[PDB]
Amino acid sequence: HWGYGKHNGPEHWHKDFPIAKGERQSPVDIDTHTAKYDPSLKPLSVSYDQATSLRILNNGHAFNVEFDDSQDKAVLKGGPLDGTYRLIQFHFHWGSLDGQGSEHTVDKKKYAAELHLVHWNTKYGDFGKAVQQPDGLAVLGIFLKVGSAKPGLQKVVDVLDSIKTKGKSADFTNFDPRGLLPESLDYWTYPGSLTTPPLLECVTWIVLKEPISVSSEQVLKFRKLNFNGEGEPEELMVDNWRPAQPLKNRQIKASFK
Ligand SMILES: NS(=O)(=O)c1ccc(C(=O)O)cc1
Numbered sequence: 001h002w003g004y005g006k007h008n009g010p011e012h013w014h015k016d017f018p019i020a021k022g023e024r025q026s027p028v029d030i031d032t033h034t035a036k037y038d039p040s041l042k043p044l045s046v047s048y049d050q051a052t053s054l055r056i057l058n059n060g061h062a063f064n065v066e067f068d069d070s071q072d073k074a075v076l077k078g079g080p081l082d083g084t085y086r087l088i089q090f091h092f093h094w095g096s097l098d099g100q101g102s103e104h105t106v107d108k109k110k111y112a113a114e115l116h117l118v119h120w121n122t123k124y125g126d127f128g129k130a131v132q133q134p135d136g137l138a139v140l141g142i143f144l145k146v147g148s149a150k151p152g153l154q155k156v157v158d159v160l161d162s163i164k165t166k167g168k169s170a171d172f173t174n175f176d177p178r179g180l181l182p183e184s185l186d187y188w189t190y191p192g193s194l195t196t197p198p199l200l201e202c203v204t205w206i207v208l209k210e211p212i213s214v215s216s217e218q219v220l221k222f223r224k225l226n227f228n229g230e231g232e233p234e235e236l237m238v239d240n241w242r243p244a245q246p247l248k249n250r251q252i253k254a255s256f257k
Pocket residue numbers: 001002003007008009012013014015016017
């Protein structure tokens with residue numbers, strides 16, 4: 001099965017998912033000097049006040065915090081987006097050490113981790129239909145660097161001991177994702193893909209320029225999770241990131257002058 005190891009990692013995914021070599025794959029390196037300010041971008045609206053988190057799941061590749069997306073509650077609008085995109089889940093990608101872990105890079109810089117807030121375009125009715133559309137998804141990506149602790153992350157950190165292995169889940173109600181944002185909403189945007197199989201080319205990426213700081217202790221707890229299921233040999237869940245892919249016929253636009 002696909003994963004991140006030597007025998008099943010990103011360099012193998014194309015055999016079973018040939019779109020891995022496609023024309024709008026993610027992540028990419030963000031060359032900050034070539035990215036151009038785009039005055040046509042409308043103000044970005046991250047509206048998470050009525051979010052309803054439900055559950056946290058170790059799916060064997062990351063952990064997902066899942067949300068009720070049966071009505072417009074936590075939504076993302078504006079910026080490059082046409083219409084309303086509902087939050088369905090967030091997850092992270094992270095490294096074995098602080099010097100790697102992000103999927104996107106900034107002038108080739110790798111951050112310690114990267115948060116993905118995943119949203120689907122309500123015009124398509126359900127997530128499954130949305131991933132049949134070029135504009136079906138919007139992922140808000142936020143870099144993590146190691147420094148001071150992120151208080152709004154601690155509830156996530158503290159539940160991880162209860163979902164150590166693949167297939168375990170736990171209640172995760174009343175979690176407010178606004179506590180994971182940075183101060184500034186300055187961003188870069190480009191058209192891309194899911195960064196894990198099935199690698200579908202459905203995503204408008206919105207990558208915030210300002211990282212959040214998390215403490216070493218917080219990210220160290222991410223790295224105690226397991227890729228494996230209960231009773232199987234322990235394989236620490238680390239380095240669950242795809243490297244940057246070819247930019248091909250794309251431009252990265254900036255929201256800021
Ligand atoms: N293309 S892939 O889904 O990454 C993949 C890689 C390896 C194996 C395997 O060793 O069994 C199966 C699938």
